[PDB]
């Protein structure tokens, strides 16, 4: 039961690590963690919810974010046709992805940087994940917009990259010639 008291902010130096891969099959304490994330993800979506135990609404979340520095991911998101993305991780990794880049209009905000930060957040338009689930099972996803989005932002957790490494530097707001630009 996670709440904004155990999420680390930007500044602390295990959000600049490389996280450490899980050794599968998981322990009963590595399965306690990742399970956590994902249910702190689905919970700080009920408004209710988070009120009542101080969360913030994140669609995903990576274990260096609780100051844990393991490859554990979870993702609870639903896309522009309604259809619900929702996984918890071990070991994630972008096998594949588009030449062809997209980003949120509105930029994005993480759970660990209380502050705006404007600009344009670039990322592949498509990729194909693999991991391994709570019970064993090793998924190959083929995503793409939002959805690929957020795993994108999660894996980057876990190899010590913020979102903000991905804003053009020189004018946070340069349209990309070719670039899906995602905001209605
Ligand atoms: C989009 C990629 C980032 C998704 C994950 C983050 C939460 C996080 O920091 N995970 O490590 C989130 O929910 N960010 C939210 C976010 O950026 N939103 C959520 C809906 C889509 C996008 C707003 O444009 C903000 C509002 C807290
Ligand atoms: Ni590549
Ligand atoms: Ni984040």
Known sequence: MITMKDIIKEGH???????????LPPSEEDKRILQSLLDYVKMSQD??????YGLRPGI?????????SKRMIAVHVTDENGTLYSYALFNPKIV????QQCYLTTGEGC???????????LRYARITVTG???????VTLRLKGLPAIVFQHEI???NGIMFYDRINPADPFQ??????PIGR
Do not use: C, F, M
Not at 13 to 23: N, S
Not at 111 to 121: A, H, I, M, T
Not at 175 to 180: H, L
């Open 96 to 99: 594949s992805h588009s030449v």
């Open 47 to 52: 408004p209710e919810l988070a009120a009542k």
């Open 156 to 158: 980057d957790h876990l």
């Open 175 to 180: 349209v990309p010639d070719g670039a899906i």
């Open 132 to 138: 391994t689930t709570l019970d064993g099972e090793e």
């Open 111 to 121: 759970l660990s940087v209380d502050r705006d930060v404007p600009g344009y957040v």
């Open 13 to 23: 130096p295990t959000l600049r690590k490389v996280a450490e891969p899980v050794p």
């Open 60 to 68: 995903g979340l990576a274990a260096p974010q609780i100051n844990v």
